Amino acid sequence: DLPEIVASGDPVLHEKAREVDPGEIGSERIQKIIDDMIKVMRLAPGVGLAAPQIGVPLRIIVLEDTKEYISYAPKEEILAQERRHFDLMVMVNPVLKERSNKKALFFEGCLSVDGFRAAVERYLEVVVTGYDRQGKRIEVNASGWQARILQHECDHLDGNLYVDKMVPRTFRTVDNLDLPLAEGCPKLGSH
Amino acid sequence: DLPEIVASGDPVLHEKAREVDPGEIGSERIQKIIDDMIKVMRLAPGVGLAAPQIGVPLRIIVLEDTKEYISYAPKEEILAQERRHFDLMVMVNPVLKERSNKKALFFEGCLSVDGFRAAVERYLEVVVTGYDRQGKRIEVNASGWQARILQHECDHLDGNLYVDKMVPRTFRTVDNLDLPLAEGCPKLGSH
Ligand SMILES: [Zn+2]
Ligand SMILES: [Zn+2]
């Protein structure tokens, strides 16, 4: 039977999650959770999902950008965002940190806050250490849309949601997403 | 037929509205708009509504708390918020200023962002100058839930929405509204 995605308000989403004990990473209990996450993330079509997003107070994140997800989207868009597909990925106790201060500005969404989008700023290049699905210890280096997902997803693990990181007055309805930015709003894009 | 409430994203909501020319206040054109607002505000049951919330880039706000709106709501709640009914009110080119530093923390919502609530801080006592429905000049002094509505509604006139003023990690689904605050969050209520 499957767990649902929790929405804002639910304390689990706005509280620091506990590090999963390496070694228990291989645990069936945990491997289950990881599978659940992966599934849900794919279920309601998404590219990221943190344990807390399903009631699990653990530091576990799953991510993936399939060329089919990207398939459907403005070529010029996909370009500017620097979005590229990347095989499913799982990280327990990830520890993220920017590889450089270059940043970018685009809209984000979260399955815990649907119907809405907001332009938030993220680091363009980042590096995340931590363990992989098998309790093995990995160092993933990324940039572009993948770096954003990592940041987004890792924040979830600290109780932070994009809404408390968005630029003023860019917040909007999924539907009005393509509407013009209000004057005084930074323009989208990189450096 | 009637105008609909615009949702975030729509530039009108995030841009400073223009002062309505005193004298045109009595204008039928404007008196219409004021009526529309009053209607809509009552239509989808609400207590505040700013011109921009219906595509009108003007500095006009309408508000009203009926003992019937107040009717159904926790007696201890209504109490703590210091909410009291007040006859419909209309203000063009209102100019609001706190009467004192004292503040309070409660959840707010906006018809341009439904399904969501967030705890935002407001001034407990305030004073708003400006004209009334008839182009007549007024000075309204308020406190409690009425002061909040004034602030909320006036912000709309400057392109500011509560989301860019909410306390971090209190944002939530209408449904999860009664859920516990996450740890590290200020407690609701007046000092
Ligand atoms: Zn999310
Ligand atoms: Zn509002």
Swiss-Prot record, chains A, B:
It is found in: Plastid, Chloroplast stroma; Mitochondrion. Disruption phenotype: No visible phenotype. GO terms for molecular function: metal ion binding; peptide deformylase activity. It comes from the Eukaryota. The keyword Mitochondrion applies. Expressed in roots, leaves, flowers and siliques. Substrate binds at P45, G46, V47, G48, G109. Zn(2+) binds at C110, H152, H156. It is an enzyme of class 3 (hydrolase). GO terms for cellular component: chloroplast; chloroplast stroma; mitochondrion; plant-type cell wall. It catalyses: N-terminal N-formyl-L-methionyl-[peptide] + H2O = N-terminal L-methionyl-[peptide] + formate. Inhibited by actinonin. The active site is at E153. One of its GO terms (biological process) is translation. Binds 1 Zn(2+) ion per subunit. Its EC number is 3.5.1.88. Its cofactor is Zn(2+). Residues 113-118, 158-176 are annotated as: Dimerization. Keywords: Chloroplast, Hydrolase, Metal-binding, Mitochondrion, Plastid, Protein biosynthesis, Transit peptide, Zinc. Belongs to the polypeptide deformylase family. Removes the formyl group from the N-terminal Met of newly synthesized proteins. Homodimer. This is Peptide deformylase 1A, chloroplastic/mitochondrial. It comes from Arabidopsis thaliana (Mouse-ear cress). The gene is PDF1A. The chain holds residues 79 to 267 of 269 of the full protein.
